[PDB]
Amino acid sequence: GFDLSTATTLFWRPVPVHVKQQDREDVLEELTFRILTGVAKQNHNLRILRIHISSDSDLFFLHTLEVSEEDFQSLKNDQGILVDFASFPGKIISLLEKCILAQPGDSPRFQAVLTIRGGESVFKIVEINDWKQLPHITLAFRPGN
């Protein structure tokens, strides 16, 4: 992807995720999330947000999202995001924490979901209330690093 210089890791923690895939059992497992911000020198110092999902018991379980400042403009509209690119990672971190802290008896309840598909996977954090699954964020990840 982007060669990040001055890259800074903002978040590096395990998160409980409901991993869904067609034809397979749903598995609830801890996945490692790393959120990095950086400047792409090969691309006129564009700011990049990188999120990497990995498993410490499967070296081939690898999912990566990269969002540049330019990618964010479309993301912001599609997802109804109201803050700027700089403030976006903090909001994601807050959502991940709600998933980490979620208890089985919660109402409403937050959960992280990763649906694995062909050459792509969709990560979402949803708030489940009495009558629907309310999506707080939906993000597309590509396989690998």
Added chain:
Amino acid sequence: FDLSTATTLFWRPVPVHVKQQDREDVLEELTFRILTGVAKQNHNLRILRIHISSDSDLFFLHTLEVSEEDFQSLKNDQGILVDFASFPGKIISLLEKCILAQPGDSPRFQAVLTIRGGESVFKIVEINDWKQLPHITLAFRPGN
């Protein structure tokens, strides 16, 4: 839609943020009517009808009809967990939250009607510190 087998569940004004093209966002009271009934041609076919109108503009008119079969795709796309019979009740609950909303609320519930080419998309969103959480999104056609 059969105007005889129909039952009106809700018929009152609601504050709505109307977004149109080439005009400034307007906050105005629009009248919402929610009806349940059956199709004229097929009595076994249950339908939900929503009508939006203005008490000041005789021509501001938007109508939605959702059949029970249409609900299945709607249900999947929007992650709705209740059945067709229970759906209108949830919409009414959301409208009520929009009615009771105060400008300083956090989060704030608001109803939004976006008009495009004269056709529209209605939604109720919950607005927090960083995004609009869509509780429902519905497409309306001009007229009655």
